[PDB]
Amino acid sequence: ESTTSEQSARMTAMDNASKNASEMIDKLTLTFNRTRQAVITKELIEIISGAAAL
Amino acid sequence: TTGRIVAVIGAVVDVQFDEGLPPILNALEVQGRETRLVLEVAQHLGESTVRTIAMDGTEGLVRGQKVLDSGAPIRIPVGPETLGRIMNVIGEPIDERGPIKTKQFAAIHAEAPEFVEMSVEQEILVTGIKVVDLLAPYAKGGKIGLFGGAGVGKTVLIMELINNVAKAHGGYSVFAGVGERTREGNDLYHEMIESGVINLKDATSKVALVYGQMNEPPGARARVALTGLTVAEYFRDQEGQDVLLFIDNIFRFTQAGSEVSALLGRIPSAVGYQPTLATDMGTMQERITTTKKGSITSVQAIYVPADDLTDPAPATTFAHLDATTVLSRAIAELGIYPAVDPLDSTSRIMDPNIVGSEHYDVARGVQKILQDYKSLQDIIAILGMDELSEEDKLTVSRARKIQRFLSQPFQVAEVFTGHLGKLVPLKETIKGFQQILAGEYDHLPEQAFYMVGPIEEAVAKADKLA
Amino acid sequence: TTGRIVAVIGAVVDVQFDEGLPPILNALEVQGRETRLVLEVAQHLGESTVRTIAMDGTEGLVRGQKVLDSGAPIRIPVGPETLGRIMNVIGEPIDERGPIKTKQFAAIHAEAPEFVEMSVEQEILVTGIKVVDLLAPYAKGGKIGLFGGAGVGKTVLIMELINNVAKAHGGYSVFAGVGERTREGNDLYHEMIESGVINLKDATSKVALVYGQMNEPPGARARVALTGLTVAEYFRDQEGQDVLLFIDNIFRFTQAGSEVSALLGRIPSAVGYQPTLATDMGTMQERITTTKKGSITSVQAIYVPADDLTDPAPATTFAHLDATTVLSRAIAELGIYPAVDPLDSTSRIMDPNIVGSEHYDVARGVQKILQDYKSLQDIIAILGMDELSEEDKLTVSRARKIQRFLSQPFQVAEVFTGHLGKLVPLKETIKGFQQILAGEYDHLPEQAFYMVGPIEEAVAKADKLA
Amino acid sequence: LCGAIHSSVAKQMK
Amino acid sequence: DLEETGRVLSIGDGIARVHGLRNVQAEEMVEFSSGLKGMSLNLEPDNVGVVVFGNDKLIKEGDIVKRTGAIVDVPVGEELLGRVVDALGNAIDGKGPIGSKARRRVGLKAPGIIPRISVREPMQTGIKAVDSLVPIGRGQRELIIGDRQTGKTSIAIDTIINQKRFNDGTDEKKKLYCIYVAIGQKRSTVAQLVKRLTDADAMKYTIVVSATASDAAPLQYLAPYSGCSMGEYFRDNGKHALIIYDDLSKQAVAYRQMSLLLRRPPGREAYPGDVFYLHSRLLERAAKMNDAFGGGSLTALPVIETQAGDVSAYIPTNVISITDGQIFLETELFYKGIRPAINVGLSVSRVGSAAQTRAMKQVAGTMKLELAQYREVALDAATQQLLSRGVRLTELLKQGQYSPMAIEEQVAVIYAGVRGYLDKLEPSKITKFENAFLSHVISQHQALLGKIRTDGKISEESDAKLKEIVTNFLAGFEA
Amino acid sequence: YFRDNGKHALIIYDDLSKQAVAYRQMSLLLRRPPGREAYPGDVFYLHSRLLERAAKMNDAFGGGSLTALPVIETQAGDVSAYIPTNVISITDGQIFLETELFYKGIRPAINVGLSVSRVGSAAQTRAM
Amino acid sequence: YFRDNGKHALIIYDDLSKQAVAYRQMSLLLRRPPGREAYPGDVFYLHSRLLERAAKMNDAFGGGSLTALPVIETQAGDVSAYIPTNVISITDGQIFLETELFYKGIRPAINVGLSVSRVGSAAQTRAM
């Protein structure tokens, strides 16, 4: 009974954990791409402000 | 004096004067206009030309149009006669109830109270809101700040505070509408009339209203805060009274300033903001204070652009407050209201010598367990709660019960919560959290602690749940 | 009018005129040079001086060098003579096959069809390719995003598309290689020749080519899509054909737009793109539609920067897409050709109210059978394909047949595969997949549905395989 | 990492 | 005549620099030799910066520029109904001129505090999920927010089509004229949209202002305001209009392009400091007038497209802080076939409650509650009962396009669900049940429907009969 | 004045974060072009010049001293950002505090691993 | 010279990241407009004109060839930066190197998954 139960449980646990990791990967990628874009923009606007102030 | 518009760029107008150039901060009067159009002198450009900011739309203005120097900054009606009326930046009435007859007219531009005028009396202001009262108590005559992203709960929190604090208050109240929703102004006005706080007949009104909402050009939104503050100044000083000052929303002052700063010819600072952001903000917030002459308890709502608390605006406001209530979108989304962040709302009053040891200790215990839970969040995230220590499970469980017991049903929010409003006395707040900390309710289901008043209701809701 | 060069700064040349100042978008012929040097007026700087963008290198230009105003924008040879010929940005032939003598030329800049000329209904462009026509159909006069890259049959798909449109609709095709690598442009030429969609002898060529090579200045790569588009509009407007326009690749069209903007000194917007991102794209894209005389359907190869779909480039593109065609290395490797991913490729016209209820129910039905199979696959090979319920046994068998029936021999590959290409009519497609979902062909071997055309051919192969 | 196998038996066992 | 005329000094980057025009006003329209119109934006000592409302290519140094003496305004009035125009108010449907008898500045300031009153009249969208859970009132601002292809526009369109029942009726008060502003969309899409509205006979009471992807940025920018002015005519004459801004994200990009070309300091996402104000002054104009100002109203449904569901981005947060609630559409529900793809829990209506029919409160109030119970969960009989509701009720909220339901027909079907007449029914049969039950009441029980409609409430009488009807139907409802 | 007269002074600059913001405003207003993060290109020099004035004088010079405690407000606990690292690259050590530590009950919220002193035991009594 | 006279040449550009820096210096001091990373709008054109000069000539043109092996240095793995993005798109393929592979023992540190050759097999001997 033990071995069956444990494997059912483990199967369930790992299935759920990989799902949670998937969602967390998706969410992190979104954050990555927002930050990547804000960084580009922010660096560029520094360049323009400096240029324009001459 | 007589000057002529020589340049018009949105809210920024340049006026040329042949003789007698008007000093900075002086209100000029555009001629040939149906409604009064004031232009505040912002700078002297040289060549007898001054740069100004309009307090109303500049549509229809023609080059050469005549402008007169009024001889003084924008002056508004101050005094009891402002109570129950509604005015605009320039003090004119906007309630269609006729003229405002006062003896005195104050300028909306005043130097801040001097360092010798400062008060230092620390005294708790019980609001009856569990989270605030426990974790970051407000103070009488102190400065309160409600931080929040779009739609998170600022306005409902201010209206709830008005309901709890202002109602039971001996003194006058001033409400400055700053760059927000006109329709909220109409709701406020009618709500106040209905309650009787604004009596349109008797001379018993206790609230003065000042508005300059999102429908105003930048120049007006940049000065309304100064207008309602000037009204509050009088009651504070020229009456030695406990005044309450509510502003929604003070961020709109700073944002109004970025819109014109571009037109004023200044090199932009970080994030496109005006390089004078902090000094503009400072000369204004330093006037919003208690002095030895009288006390002003101010509550300011503060909008957080893109929910980014590090944005120059919100970030600069933190140093102007004695107590902060920081609202979170993620907290609101979990259904917790008010959506206060228990780990980011602080208060200078949160000292064992002021709120006492029992209160200080429970507040610190609540925050420790919330922080400890916060640490386990990541672990919970991946492997869930089963690969968790029996010890940690217990912190998680209590934390979640504390996290829900921090939520509260507001009157103003009754339609959205589906629950009757509750007001919990400080002593009961302390006890509820003490007991949960002590594991006394480790047997009740979290859900029983959600949306209730005193801990007693938590228990009663637990039985209800069977 | 003749002007004079007053400034040369890289790809930006300033030309002064005496009288008759050339309007913006006009073409200017530089005088005294080996190769033709065209300048396109971008701005009027004042003082009879115009600012232009060079379509080729500016080396050797001298201040005062004569520049003739052509009286109009860039005009290229348009008409049947363009077919099977390779053209440049400014309409010059770059195939060493002499002039491209058409009856008339046409301006690469045009306004988009007026609201009154728009087709009021959503039609479908049957391409005769099972995956596409069934699951993610092309909208007549629509924009299709070709997601793929090299090594997945992109060129074979394109060529087949051209061939099928010529035969099943009488419409010709145009290929706009925006930022074409010379090496890859030579190969695809000769490749087109091999397939036959281009012909050096007769006048049977179905494709006309416009190339904006990577060597070329920004101004040239920015305009090629317009040159190619002008070609296509000719067959739609003057011959009421249903043209097909290939843009490879839409992303290099944007980037070239950024570069020109940069050179012109315009302040960059988010992520460094040009402030006119949306307008640069809309003015080009809106030329691609269904008019009352015909339509242009555009298959646009898309490159997504950083795999970020929310990047300003791709997100601006998607506003105009009516469908996407996804080619996958995975699908390819299963030997399924074309390597079209059945569940990734999407379409807006895949709507009951547009492609009909039958088509809709069969399309979805295939999509779902495939999605279920995907789910089941986890158990199948890993956990043993044995304890599969009567229901599951059939889902897997039918799904695998359908997935195989989605492949199809292209007429273009004929020379290499030694198998007749099959252009499958929408009616045949719908019937087939409908029957396999039904269960009618649950008694034939998979291979019978592999690389066939009409469903009949599936049964035929089955019998021959036994 | 057996989900909550171990916890159940151990709790009821002691 | 440099007093009333000017000569173009320079043209490029969208702003034309005009020499002369000594007597132009700020924000006044001017005409270009080419028939192009423009707006006097910056009155500088030596020139006038003009925003060109069209292709600036049609302008050259030297071109005469004449004054109109009018502050930018647009044609207004009932003569625009059934018409498709551009941002300037010019007809583009090829149906001859507009015989407009009045004009209204595009930039008027919104009504102040005194003239307004709290929203209290239902603005029925005809979409169950919205009229029950996110009830819109007249004079309210309600954002339609979501990612691309999440059915944002669809919501707007069903609502327009729903007004036919009122507009063709007797009761004037219940009428609602519609205005659809298309900003940055494709021409094709607009042409198809007016074609669908025509077939639905909803074009007769609808005005369409169109500044599409090929139109110059200044036209896309203006469009919203011109349509708003056309909506104020109704607002201020005791009538009721509905305006749709689709979408405001594309308008903000057009204004961003204009602002960078003006070399205004780029800030968050390179947007100007006035992007908030751009939308704030506009949306403040939808309002609910009190009786002393005629009692009219203007309901606004601005559309905002989020990128990957980020409702915390700058623009999205901006509009959210202007409007009175938002309907969020999740990319994920749409894909999962849940249509409309509305996310109950995240969608709010700050003021619509007071404007929700009483017949709805009686069933929708209890429905939302039961949706909350379900939400907290998804064994144990308790939680099981809660989960049973969720699936059922969730199916009820599904609705196809182009078939806006009357309020009485919405309360009837929702009643089925919240009362329990769906619990012993297979989830997948729920939508089948709804459709058969609706037809059943619509035909064999018009009297009951009309009762609930007229009384605006479900009284004990109506409730008794309705109970009978549903039960009877269940018994006869085949698997 | 104490430092150069045989006496010992302690100075607290609370805080240098807002000082640099006032510096940015004034410099931007003087028409000097914004450098990194909109701060002037010599924000490091602004603080470096100041903080070096704190020092130990030898006996020949009176043996006086000036001890400095500059304060810097970080955002979202990022000690690695530009302004913070600028000032850290000036001073003789740092005391980094954190809200996480604070709420967990570690008060003062000193983060040991990240804080340092560049003087070490030379500034402690033998006993300590 | 070799390419055209029927011979075959191979050229290494080590590295294009630095030439791009050099050109950015001239452009910015020439007051040409700055763009992403402060590069000018013709920086892609600058490398595309150079890389297209690598070519395989047909028999009638001598049959020569010029193969180019340009080098690009990335920052912290950012192949999406401006210069890298450009040169990646101009070329026929990329040999991606990674530090993690290097120190892990894989040397040469070539990432076999990401590295590609659009020419592939067409230039590989039958036995390979």
Ligand SMILES: Nc1ncnc2c1ncn2[C@@H]1O[C@H](COP(=O)(O)OP(=O)(O)NP(=O)(O)O)[C@@H](O)[C@H]1O
């Ligand atoms: N205490 C509360 N209880 C329940 N719901 C609340 C509460 N506070 C806010 N909400 C919900 O959130 C909505 C917005 O509240 P509100 O006080 O108007 O937000 P805000 O922060 O001022 N928004 P904004 O001014 O638009 O940026 C309310 O209408 C409710 O739906």
Ligand SMILES: Nc1ncnc2c1ncn2[C@@H]1O[C@H](COP(=O)(O)OP(=O)(O)NP(=O)(O)O)[C@@H](O)[C@H]1O
């Ligand atoms: N209630 C609905 N039921 C079924 N299908 C629907 C529904 N609403 C929309 N759709 C379908 O989904 C498509 C997309 O909806 P649409 O209103 O265009 O979304 P959108 O968010 O406004 N898109 P876009 O403007 O292109 O970003 C429509 O063409 C319909 O075919």
Ligand SMILES: [Mg+2]
């Ligand atoms: Mg608010």
Ligand SMILES: [Mg+2]
């Ligand atoms: Mg839409």
